[PDB]
Write a structure and sequence with these properties.
monomer; 140 residues; mainly beta; seven-stranded antiparallel beta sheet; four-stranded antiparallel beta sheet; 1 helix; globular; binds ligand A1BRS; binds zinc ion; Protease 2A
Length: 140
């Protein structure tokens, strides 16, 4: 679990969004595993605006933050896991690292701020849903 709190927005994994998130929906895209809802209180996170390929991510299944190199956001075939079937996911970045389903929502960050959130994993890779192209998170 986990979310990004930027301005009056809450960014979560679409597959983990709550009824309150859907009832206060700003934007969602199933192909990216992202959902954005509106909040009453403002948040403290800053979104990175950059093309970094190195950063640090939080892994809840290890209680640890790990430094990683990751690929640029791409359309990737995600293999079937125990709870979800094989499917294509867009704006996804991959790194070599540990992840389990419950790690989704952990932040990946670079020197410029939040890059994305853990969204996929398996075969020793962790995938992050990018948020750096969502420029509107910075206003209104
Ligand atoms: C980190 N990590 N995550 C997963 C995982 O299954 N994520 C769900 C991926 C997912 C995205 C979008 C939808 S949608 C919006 O199309 O319904 C459903 C599912 C995973 C598995 C195995 C090891 C690691 C893992
Ligand atoms: Zn950066």
């Amino acid at each position: 679990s986990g979310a990004i709190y930027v301005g009056n927005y809450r960014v979560v994994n679409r597959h983990l969004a709550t009824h309150n998130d859907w009832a206060n929906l700003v934007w969602e895209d199933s192909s990216r595993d992202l959902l954005v809802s509106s909040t009453t209180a403002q948040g403290c996170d800053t979104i990175a605006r950059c093309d970094c390929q190195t950063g640090v991510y939080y892994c809840s299944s290890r209680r640890k933050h790990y430094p990683v190199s990751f690929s640029k956001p791409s359309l990737i075939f995600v293999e079937a896991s125990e709870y979800y079937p094989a499917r294509y996911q867009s704006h996804l970045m991959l790194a070599v690292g540990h992840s389990e389903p419950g790690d989704c929502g952990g932040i990946l960050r670079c020197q410029h701020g939040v890059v994305g959130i853990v969204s996929t994993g398996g075969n020793g890779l962790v995938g992050f849903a990018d948020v750096r192209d969502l420029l509107w998170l910075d206003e209104e």
